[PDB]
Ligand binder design. Structure first.
Ligand code: S3T
Length: 466
């Protein structure tokens, strides 16, 4: 029909081939279920309408099916639309030195070229505003973007070119508050500045929880949604594609293993009871601060193979502290049912539990195919990417919740530099922790031996009331 005849031919332009069962599948604006990358690019910059939901989802998840350099080449290719030849009558007009009517050329420029080109510029703008890290990780990509943007000509394009340049410059500059005063910083045995004495029992439990909550809040807020797409944190380029997520994972591993280390390396039973009791008090302050990430880190340490088996230690833990620990565990049961109910009911600020998102994204990545087949052709399963983007969107709704708590730089550095494993690998260190657990509390027939004290300071906690 004339609709396809008005569009450019497939021999000079790839984004005008008609829709079909073997290049695009759908789930007012239709929702894309699957398609070839060309059809995804076409609909990302569609001439009939804007689609901000799709633009946001595509730019969050495209690195799982298209490289940044390839996306830029494709949207530049999309932008470069050939114009139709003059009609026979207008050819005669041009050869006679007269102005052609150019009715179809003008209609095509207004109803197709200008909308598609403005839609490409809108993708460029969203890309530099929300995903500038692609340009920080690849200077050549930015050079190509600035060259493309800098050569765009048009009255209607001018405003778009300036906003894109403004955002890029604002991002380069960034690379190079509270209504009330925060509470008084709490000290226990260790004095301010005496970093050498800082430890689990010498720092105030309230302040350990406050400083770990600020540390974890900052780590949570730094994770970008694309660090979780396509399971890139479990792949080779994880250090470049997921630096903030890996920093959050490594913190959780170091903090959890440090709590286990403090517990099993305290051989004296009475002292180990004081250590465990202090870690439950730290969990109590994490609850008060709505740091669910911190609460579930303590749960993980208490449920670990070396700690969970310490029946002689938990026997001496007051019933009230055991019930607090049991209810924190129940946050994880029934697929984190109670945890999600608590998160949706609390008032900000909070630090959500990050692990649940990683688990659910891995389940979505492993349980859904990368491509869908239709008539022998492979289409990118975009609904899979949309589901991952919806989960990462849940992460983002809590990333603008700063805490009215004063940073204590020395305590902050103490927790940033925690290295319980030392030179050991994780598996070998956890085997050491379990073998250490068998040493301090041997299995049933072997009796419980007595061990000497290691702390030359009082074990009584100052409590959790500020
Ligand atoms: C079926 O498996 C489990 C059920 C649990 N049920 C409850 C209610 N709490 C648990 N753990 C909490 C955090 C806790 C309380 C007291 C002492 C210690 N050490 C840990 C559980 C751990 C389990 O497995 C590891």
């Amino acid at each position: 029909g004339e609709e396809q005849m008005r569009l450019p031919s497939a021999d000079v332009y790839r984004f005008a081939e008609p829709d079909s069962e073997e290049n695009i599948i759908f789930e007012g604006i239709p929702i894309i279920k699957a398609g070839t990358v060309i059809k995804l690019i076409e609909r990302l910059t569609y001439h009939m309408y804007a689609d901000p939901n799709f633009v946001r989802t595509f730019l969050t998840t495209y690195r799982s099916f298209c490289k940044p350099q390839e996306l830029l080449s494709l949207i530049i290719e999309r932008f470069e639309i050939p114009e139709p030849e003059p009609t026979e009558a207008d050819r005669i007009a041009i050869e006679n030195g007269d102005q052609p009517l150019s009715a179809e050329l003008k209609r095509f420029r207004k109803e197709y070229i200008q909308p598609v080109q403005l839609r490409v510029l809108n993708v460029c703008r969203h890309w530099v505003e929300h995903h500038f890290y692609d340009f920080e990780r690849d200077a050549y990509l930015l050079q190509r973007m600035e060259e493309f943007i800098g050569t765009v000509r048009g009255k209607a394009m001018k405003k778009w070119v300036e906003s894109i340049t403004k955002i890029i410059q604002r991002k380069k500059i960034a690379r190079d508050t509270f209504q009330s005063s925060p509470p008084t910083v709490e000290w226990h045995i260790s004095r301010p500045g005496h970093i050498e004495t800082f430890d689990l029992l010498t720092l105030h439990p309230i302040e350990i929880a406050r400083q770990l909550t600020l540390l974890e809040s900052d780590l949570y807020r730094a994770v970008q949604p694309s660090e979780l797409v396509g399971s890139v944190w479990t792949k080779e380029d994880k250090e470049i594609n997921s630096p903030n997520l890996l920093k959050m994972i490594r913190h959780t591993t170091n903090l959890t293993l440090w709590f286990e280390k403090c517990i099993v390396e305290t051989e004296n039973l009475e002292e180990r009871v004081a250590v465990v009791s202090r870690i439950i008090e730290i969990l109590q302050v994490f609850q008060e601060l709505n740091n669910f990430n911190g609460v579930l880190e303590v749960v993980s340490a208490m449920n670990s193979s070396p700690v969970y088996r310490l029946d002689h230690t938990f026997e001496q833990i007051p019933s009230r502290q055991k019930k607090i620990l049991e209810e924190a565990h129940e946050l994880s049961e029934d697929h984190y049912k109670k945890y999600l109910a608590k998160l949706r009911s609390i008032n900000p600020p909070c630090v959500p539990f990050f692990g649940i998102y990683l688990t659910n994204i891995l389940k979505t990545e492993e349980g859904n195919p990368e491509v869908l087949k239709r008539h022998g052709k492979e289409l990118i399963n975009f609904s899979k990417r949309r589901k991952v983007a919806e989960i990462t969107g849940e992460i983002q709704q809590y990333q603008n919740q700063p805490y009215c708590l004063r940073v204590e730089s020395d305590i902050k550095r103490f927790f940033e530099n925690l290295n319980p494993m030392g030179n050991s690998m994780e598996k070998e260190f956890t085997d050491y922790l379990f073998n250490k657990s068998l040493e301090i509390e041997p299995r049933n027939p072997k009796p419980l031996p007595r061990f000497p004290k290691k702390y030359s300071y009082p074990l009584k906690s100052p409590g959790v009331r500020p």
